[PDB]
Amino acid sequence: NDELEIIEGMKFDRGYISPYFINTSKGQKCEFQDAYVLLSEKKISSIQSIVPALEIANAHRKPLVIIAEDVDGEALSTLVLNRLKVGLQVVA
Amino acid sequence: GQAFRKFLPLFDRVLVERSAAETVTKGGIMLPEKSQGKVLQATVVAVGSGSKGKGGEIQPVSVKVGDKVLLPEYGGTKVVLDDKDYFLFRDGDILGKYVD
Amino acid sequence: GQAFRKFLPLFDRVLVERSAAETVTKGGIMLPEKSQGKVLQATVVAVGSGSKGKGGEIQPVSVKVGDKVLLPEYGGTKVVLDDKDYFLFRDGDILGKYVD
């Protein structure tokens, strides 16, 4: 049959990198409210470039989304680490 | 000169232990291990007798055991004692002393 | 020899603080940060005891704390004290003194 689907908002066909950002205990979702956004054109390679954005997010105590060309294994290890212990709210 | 755990440097050397790794930041963020290099602040645990080159009497080392020091970046040998990495530098190479 | 904030150089060294960054020009224009390099005029804040190589007695450093000096281009190690970059040179390397 025919279907009418009304998307509300914006959407792109690409998911989170590491399956540790899931804070939902539900159908495998990372779900935030009142989050920050970090838009990077080229890759986030090092620990150096990523730390200041996270210092902002933890200070203001809001989640943070990281939309970049990619999140390298070094900055990624920091993101997953800060996610799994005390519990900074991030996702890439 | 003074010794350490079954170890004693020779003539000029100084056995140090690098200080903490600085895993978290000051405010509230927290850091990995590939970054963060090797800490340059260390504590001296053994000291060699004295400079052999000093004519006649030996010139004893200046940094005394139990001090905190600012290490150089490069010069230094890795020694393993009781499965703890300690680093053996030369007395002339130690940059500063954290007196306080 | 004289110390600084919980820091003291060893035997020949000199801990200096580089002077301003020169952000604007003389007349009326204003400059970025990638240019302007590292300023060569600095102020000395700590001084090591004295040259160990001097036979018998140590030879004290000549540049005394509180002086302005013209640094060399290359020689120098970066030290961080209280989150302010200070640079540690050797006494023989310091070019000139701004006496006035």
Add this chain to the structure above:
Amino acid sequence: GQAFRKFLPLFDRVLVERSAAETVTKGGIMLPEKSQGKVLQATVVAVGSGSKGKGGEIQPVSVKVGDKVLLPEYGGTKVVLDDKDYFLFRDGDILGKYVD
């Protein structure tokens, strides 16, 4: 100075015997031979008379026969005595002494 099996070093040298090969690990696993490199802990078996460079009187070697020492990584010559590899270093090159 003291000798070893029909051998005697000259003026500064020190003949050591490298210690065990470390075939097995601490816990219970067991290792190959391409790995494990060359052991840096050795025992001194011959000692040369004394430093020729010392003006007038010779300055005798400091490491005395029968000591355990921390060898450097590179400096050293291979000698064959009774088909047992012994290594001949210079007295200044020996890093530490395992006093105990």
